[PDB]
């Protein structure tokens, strides 16, 4: 309860950690720790009745967030781990169920059958992109196919639980916590050309309430980099 | 020199052989390893995780996320069928495209048991009771609440716990996992009544496969 890191502090009370490993350290690298290990709270999204889902690309959502956005442009390479806190706050009269998963290397498919999606439509800079519950048209040039029952990757949406996941059920649970190590082939990669993780939030059983209650339940995502090291002189 | 004598089956190319092969690029000094997390040693370790079962197909929910939810509402009849699906293997049933059923369409002989986890994704003030009757292979499907109670069953109270685990064998009639209303959904004022139920499936960890083949989920 009431953990602190750097100059930021959140309040907690079960944590699922990666593929069984904890994030740890390894020309020559430098390791900065006093100015990157803090909780960058992304701003809150709203969960309405006919909502579909959200996704963030992970070393892209912190590209403008303070000093971590400066070390992405100054240093060429780097490798980090992450620690994700998700918590939505509803009363005892709401109902629903989320799925918080963290997909590594989530390559998405374009709407047009021949092209590839552009940069502005894969990742919103510190802003959540949205799935849809209908199809995306074929006639538009280059946009991400966001049919939520195929999860944008051409896969079954039910089988997405093989990745490290955690259920948020508003009857009994309220929050979720994930710890993800660095999963890549090369031991140190670029941070602009590549997005090695993807955090997805999908509502399976949709929100429902009576007449009178507040018609939206906000979600809060809080990310903190762990054991980061860059490469340069 | 040394006298040899070639047997039949000498200059043939068997596609499933195992012989020492000449290397094309020697003196290469190959790239060494690196400890990447999440190594898979056996394909059963994919099937041990739990996956949501599309138990609500009905021809208009297959292109949506309502394929995974079972509608539960407070009706007026006492004793009614909530759902029911056979365990007949691969014959267009609901365990076909799940993560358990997608590995077991690569093999032709398999045997084991199955964990079946349910979960009540409803309000926190709503209560009720459910039967989970499992009929063995050979016996018929129960056509009533009373003769579903006489078979093997587990009564699931929603108010105390919100997840009921049921273990059941599955072999290559084969059984039914029908579920019945015991009482209605009693709910207070200013709460919605239409609650939904998710269903999970897994492998019970002692099951084997044999005789690999190719999958029929292709052109």
């Amino acid at each position, epitope marked *: 309860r009431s953990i602190t890191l750097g100059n930021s502090t959140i309040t907690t009370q079960n944590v699922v950690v990666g593929y069984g490993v904890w994030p740890e350290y390894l020309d020559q690298p430098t390791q900065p720790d006093v100015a990157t290990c803090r909780f960058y709270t992304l701003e809150s999204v709203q969960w*309405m*009745k*006919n*909502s*579909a889902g959200w996704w963030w690309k992970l070393p892209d959502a912190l590209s403008q967030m303070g000093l971590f956005g400066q070390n992405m442009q100054y240093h060429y390479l780097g490798r980090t781990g992450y620690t994700i806190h998700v918590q939505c706050n509803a009363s005892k009269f709401h109902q629903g169920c989320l799925l918080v998963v963290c997909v590594p290397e989530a390559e998405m498919g374009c709407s047009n059958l021949n092209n590839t999606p552009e940069f502005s439509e894969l990742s919103g800079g510190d802003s959540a992109r*949205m799935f*849809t*519950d*209908t*199809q*995306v*048209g*074929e*006639s*538009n040039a280059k946009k991400v196919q966001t049919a939520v029952w195929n999860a944008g990757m051409g896969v079954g949406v039910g089988n997405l639980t093989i990745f490290p996941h955690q259920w948020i059920n508003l009857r009994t649970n309220n929050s979720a916590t994930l710890v993800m190590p660095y999963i890549n082939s090369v031991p140190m990669d670029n941070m602009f050309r590549h997005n090695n993780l993807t955090l997805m939030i999908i509502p399976f059983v*949709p929100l429902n309430y009576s007449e009178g209650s507040s018609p939206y339940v906000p979600i809060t995502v809080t990310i903190a980099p762990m054991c980061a090291e860059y490469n340069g002189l | 020199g040394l006298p040899v004598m070639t047997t039949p089956g000498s200059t043939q190319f068997l596609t499933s052989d195992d012989f020492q092969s000449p290397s094309a690029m020697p003196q290469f000094d190959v790239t060494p390893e690196m400890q990447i997390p999440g190594r898979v040693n056996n394909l059963m370790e994919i099937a041990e995780v739990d996956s949501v079962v599309p138990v609500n197909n009905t*021809e*208009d*929910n297959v*292109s*949506s996320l*309502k394929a995974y939810q079972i509608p539960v509402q407070s009706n007026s009849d006492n004793g009614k069928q909530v759902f029911g699906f056979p365990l007949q293997p691969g014959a267009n049933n609901v365990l076909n495209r799940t993560l358990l059923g997608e590995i077991l369409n690569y093999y032709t002989h398999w045997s084991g048991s199955i964990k079946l986890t349910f979960m009540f994704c409803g309000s926190a003030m709503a209560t009720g009771k459910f039967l989970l009757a499992y009929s063995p292979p050979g016996a018929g499907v129960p056509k009533n609440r009373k003769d579903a109670m006489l078979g093997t069953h587990v009564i699931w109270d929603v108010g105390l716990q919100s997840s009921c685990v049921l273990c059941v064998p599955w072999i290559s009639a084969a059984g039914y996992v029908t579920c019945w209303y015991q009482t209605n959904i009693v709910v207070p004022a200013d709460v919605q009544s239409s609650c939904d139920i998710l269903c999970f499936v897994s492998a019970c960890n002692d099951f084997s496969v044999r005789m690999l083949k190719d999958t029929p989920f292709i052109r």
Partner: antibody
Amino acid sequence: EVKLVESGGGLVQPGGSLSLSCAASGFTFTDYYMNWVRQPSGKALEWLGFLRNKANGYTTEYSASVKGRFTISRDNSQSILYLQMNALRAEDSATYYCARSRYYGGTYRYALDYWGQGTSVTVS
Amino acid sequence: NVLTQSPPIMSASPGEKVTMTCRASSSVSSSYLHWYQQKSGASPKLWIYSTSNLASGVPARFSGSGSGTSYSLTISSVEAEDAATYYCQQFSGYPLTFGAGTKLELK
């Protein structure tokens, strides 16, 4: 009750521009998909494009023939719906409707239940 | 994908049982085919959605059926207010194509 009126039609030169407007009353405007269906003089109907509700990000999906020429948008303050037309040709003389969509189950079938009274646009 | 209705003009006396068809070029799913009814000089109205379900406020004489690539709408008893034009709609990919139209003239 669902009450949809639309206005803005009239005569306009080929190669010109014209902006229609469809007003909605009697329901929550930020919850339903809003379509646009035109129809020539006693012929078969044609579909133009719709605009999604607030829970899906207010995106648009035009048809193939009017892609780049027409533009569907809504106004943030009050409940009103627009359609910005550009580079009109002789075959765009039709009667324009303003339909609503709804969720039947929790699914979205592609039906159009409530239609407007229909405005007319001619070119010459 | 195109829809071809048949027949274009169809006449029926009051009291008989009549039917029309709506044929697609490719396979259209059964939950994405709807029927409309437009009277003379009025806005169209939704009649049958998801190929077998009645709309709100429609009489119970109408009933749709069919699957695959051939669908049909049959009227049990013809009355005096159901003389109009009927369209069928589909969706397999964008765009949403309407049918040609079947006109029902009373006898």
